[PDB]
Symmetry: D2
Subunit: 252 residues, 4 copies
């Protein structure tokens, strides 16, 4: 058969490791041109060619909280592959503190990436992709932590709940104005990534059946494939909705 | 490559509307499919419209017919091998408020929309567990399992029941390592014979105060999310709700 | 001051557990109450333990008995005047997975937990609408109407049905200016005969991984949210879910 | 009933000088609590306090909820007036009528500093000051139906109210697991007749449409006051981490 992302041009923030890496990998596999971003250009450069050549994928150093860099990022992708059709706001960071124990510096730093960065990408994505008949799709990475609380992830919970509902606002406005832009959120449960790998004992803790009923954590390809569905015209009637891939975590 | 390679699917109410499109795309992606429905003429024309008996067959079965469910699995397994995928899609509607619902309307709708889904889920678990099939049970709920509608009280009850019963099954299958996943799909308004035969339904649900996109969906919109859920691509998705509704429930 | 001044309530299953405490605090806040139950000895004692026939009375009625509902409303109206408040609290449990649920068990539980709430809601709307009563229908769902339980498949179905059916009723009543509100209450684990008779249930649900507060609740915890919902204090609350669960569904 | 439902409680109500917060403060005092109300404008604030009672039951403190250092002084002042705080209502909030697309970054940061950072400051400090004291403490965070559904013209506000919704669950869980005797819940009003709504031209008419609020009218501040009384009272000792929606049916359809 045929490529499910034929002619799509996608920005994937934080697309050099973990979930964002797999999203970029499967996007290219389905016919899309991809620009991945990340802060470490060393790590980011080798990540880009691990997927493919510069005719299908490229890396652009960019901090998702860099508002002005977002305009340059859209310009660079546009001159490389054509008008952007797909924005995956995946960059995010974690902070292992209860609300009580969160410093204001930790709070502000996490939210600048996890919330302001997603806002910058969604806002500019709408401005740059509306009214061009592109079948445009903005995919905002929330989490199961946008649906349930966690006593030791207070700031993260705030950021992911914000992404959850802000995305609905954007989806509604785009729909009511016939912008031809959809906005949806993805809510992964625990996924084996560097973020999880570097937290001591995280995978074993979240493999408890009282946490993930399947008794194991997921893999980055599990999130890649739902983003492929959401970037594709297969999902042209899906907007403002929450897509949960979590091993049953939130079902109990 | 075929996203449903080696899968064997039962799609109830697969002769019209959403279920027909689910069947169509399941076959397109490499699955063998048995579709059901009450009317045999519509059913045989439906199956042949999609393919030959090597990929798709029709079996006359009312989803509320408990005993018929075991025959349906047996028939599907003889034609195609072990069932891997059950799409509990058969369902009916009743345009009545809770206040105005007769008890016979209540019982009739729940026998199909709730008992039928229970029969297929329960038997699907029994017949598919512990076989390494990457089994997937896809239960058709609705946006009406998430929000109320003042004129579809019994339907609301049935779809809310399917929503939460499916989470029970998903959890039990996961905790027991059954290799069976269970998820619900929640379509918004979709252009189907159900909607076409309801006078002025499409115009009403195309209002922006109802569906923000200003139009209703098409059966393929639901087929493609069911393809994702039937495939091994979704091997970490269970107990979850997949909403394809034009923004209806986002406002 | 009485928060339920002038109110006349039917509380089904009001002879033990949660329903008993609801009736208790309803009378305390000035309501006249009819409680129902199947065992007449327990029922007469429940009523006498709260007050005399001037404030509270017992009627033997099975919530699944459709014709009995009309007699129940008639009896209550003749005793205390027009019914203003209906608490559909009667419910039962079955400790079976979806896979292991017999159709007999499925039908038994849903006849009480779903059909009974339907009968009480449908008749409550008919009998209380358009009378300036500040009428309130309070339907007892559960945390098991919000999340799944691998060993309570039929119960999950029933409580999910109650959750969404109640929204339908709330919307119709609000859009038609019936002066009837409908809301659902979602208790977490509560110390009642239902839980006490289930061996090990309290210990299981007191685990921090189940109830974060580390203990289960008490009947008065649900009585007080029901007083709020029955009172005119909540005149703008309809179609909503009131969760009193020790944090169970917040994680 | 025959007893003050908030006997012995000491409450801080941010944004307690108009609208919803004023009604919360009013009914809190009626049920026997001592209250400190905050706001930015002292003229409004001092008049609001006197409209409810004397300094034996209610006082005004001028405080911007986004002002982190002032949160410490606010709790200090409240303790000196009334004793240990038992109840925190994070109600101060502002709005911005802009789609996500049209939201300036300045508008984004300004609204979130009040609606999100302010609720974080007050929740974090409330836990620190009320934990482990046997007070039956309760933190009530004012979200909205706009923390449950989107609004195409309130992008930043949606973000703030979704954040409040889920951050509050985190705090509820931590407090419960640690036996802090602090509950945390969110309240989600639908449209309520307040200065915020009265000053938005056409807002009440728009939200009174049956397609928005099925009851065909918007609510009143006492509607939110009474669910806050329930949440601050020991009547709700088993309620934590939950969402209390008082919205005329708005989110049920
Ligand atoms: N893993 C899970 O279990 C899980 C579950 C649910 C949701 N999520 C969410 O999924 C997303 C991906 O998480 P992950 O597990 O893949 O994390 P990860 O393994 O740490 O990867 C994060 C990626 O984002 C990049 N990044 C970090 N900060 C950035 C910034 N300010 N600007 C641009 N790029 C940045 C990182 O590159 P540099 O280090 O070079 O910046 C890296 O490429 C996050 O939003 C996370 O919250 C993860
Ligand atoms: N259309 C929508 O807007 C919409 C939105 C959300 C959810 N849904 C749900 O999606 C599912 C499909 O709906 P649809 O709109 O595609 O309906 P439809 O166009 O009326 O098609 C119904 C299909 O089910 C079959 N069927 C009806 N009763 C049956 C029974 N007792 N046993 C077995 N098969 C039966 C019908 O064939 P026979 O008549 O020959 O039996 C037909 O093939 C239903 O569960 C519905 O509730 C629909
Ligand atoms: N306890 C919990 O943890 C919990 C949690 C969430 C929800 N709930 C729900 O709360 C409600 C009350 O539960 P509970 O724990 O208080 O139950 P309980 O202790 O078993 O009390 C049940 C009451 O209902 C009556 N009853 C049972 N079947 C009936 C029928 N067919 N018709 C009329 N009355 C009937 C019983 O009296 P007779 O036996 O004499 O008829 C008794 O008065 C139920 O809907 C339950 O699903 C309970
Ligand atoms: N009204 C509704 O329909 C509605 C619906 C859902 C949720 N809500 C939420 O309910 C809460 C109260 O809304 P309302 O409609 O009652 O608002 P309102 O009528 O505008 O009253 C706002 C109150 O907050 C104070 N305030 C504003 N900014 C502040 C700041 N930075 N620090 C401290 N106090 C501040 C105001 O006093 P000063 O101006 O003197 O500071 C005033 O006392 C808000 O969180 C709002 O988001 C309202
Ligand atoms: O009936 C019950 C029950 C009994 C024992 C423990 C938990 C629960 C629950 O959540 N519901 O609804
Ligand atoms: O502030 C507001 C508001 C104003 C006017 C109508 C509805 C709303 C709402 O839902 N929130 O949160
Ligand atoms: Mg809605
Ligand atoms: Mg949970």
């Amino acid at each position: 058969m045929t490529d499910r992302l034929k002619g799509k041009v996608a920005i994937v923030t934080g697309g050099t490791l973990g979930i964002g890496l797999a999203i970029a990998d499967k996007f290219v596999e389905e016919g899309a041109k991809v620009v991945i971003t990340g802060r470490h250009a060393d790590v980011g450069e080798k990540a880009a060619k691990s997927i493919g050549g510069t005719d299908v994928i490229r890396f652009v150093q960019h901090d998702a909280s860099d508002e002005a860099g977002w305009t340059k990022l859209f310009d660079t992708t546009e001159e490389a592959f054509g008008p952007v059709t797909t924005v995956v706001n995946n960059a995010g960071i974690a902070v292992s503190k209860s609300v009580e124990d969160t410093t204001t510096e930790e709070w502000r730093k996490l939210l600048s990436v996890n919330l302001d960065g997603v806002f910058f990408g969604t806002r500019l994505g709408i401005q740059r992709m509306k009214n061009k008949g592109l079948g445009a799709s903005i995919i905002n990475m929330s989490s199961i932590e946008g649906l349930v609380g966690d006593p030791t992830q207070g700031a993260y919970n705030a950021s992911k709940g914000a992404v959850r509902i802000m995305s609905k606002s954007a989806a509604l406005d785009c729909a009511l104005k016939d912008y031809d832009v959809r906005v949806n959120t993805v809510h992964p449960g625990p996924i084996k990534t560097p973020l999880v790998d570097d937290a001591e004992g995280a995978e074993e803790f979240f493999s408890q059946r009282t946490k993930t009923p399947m008794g194991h954590i997921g893999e980055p390809n599990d999130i890649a494939w739902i983003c492929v569905y959401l970037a594709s015209d297969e999902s042209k009637f899906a907007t403002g909705a929450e897509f949960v891939v979590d091993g049953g975590y939130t079902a109990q």
